[PDB]
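Known limitations

Structure tokens in this collection are predictions and should be treated as such. Users comparing against experimental data should check residue numbering before alignment. To illustrate the layout, the record for Lime is reproduced below. The input appears on top and the generated tokens appear beneath it.
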Amino acid sequence: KGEELFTGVVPILVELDGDVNGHKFSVRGEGEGDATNGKLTLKFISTTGKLPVPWPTLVTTLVQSFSRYPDHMKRHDFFKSAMPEGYVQERTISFKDDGTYKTRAEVKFEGDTLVNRIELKGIDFKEDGNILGHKLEYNFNDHQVYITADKQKNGIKANFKIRHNVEDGSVQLADHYQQNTPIGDGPVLLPDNHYLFTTSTLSKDPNEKRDHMVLLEFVTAAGI
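Generated tokens:
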């Protein structure tokens, strides 16, 4: 019955409070989601000034409840199963040869709006590495993510690596490890192993002066 709340276009609110090597910042996202086609469209704004971080390193963090799960697979969609009460999403992102992000989020319905409220902390970052030194190009190379059930936590697990391009032409790796647990006590769908594929498209609003990011994503479940 959680499948219910994603039939049409659901509005999205994204809130993130970040602290990276003491750099406190905050992002506010607004958009809509069409889970039946797997289309995500959001505009994020820095309510703090220029981000101390490259925008691309925050994509992973800024709502897989909107993935498109084929009909032949709808019994593996943990993300909508745990709604409206939502799920907690925790990640550890370790940028090779640099610092590490640790995220905690609550993905929850709040009235008509699906909300993802995140708290992020990052430590041991090189004051001028690829991240804090803003050496990462403004683009994103996705990557499949392997969903797995973790039934002792009544939730799901996944680890995956992301490659961000470097101005240098190098590649800054980011090792993701992901835990998700339901917030409510209701029963959830625990899935067999499957994948979530994504194509992200990063862009800018020419009329927006604040540090911002316009994000378009098409997400599909498959596997395999």
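For this record: The chain has one helix and eleven strands. The helical segments are 78-81. Please report discrepancies through the issue tracker.
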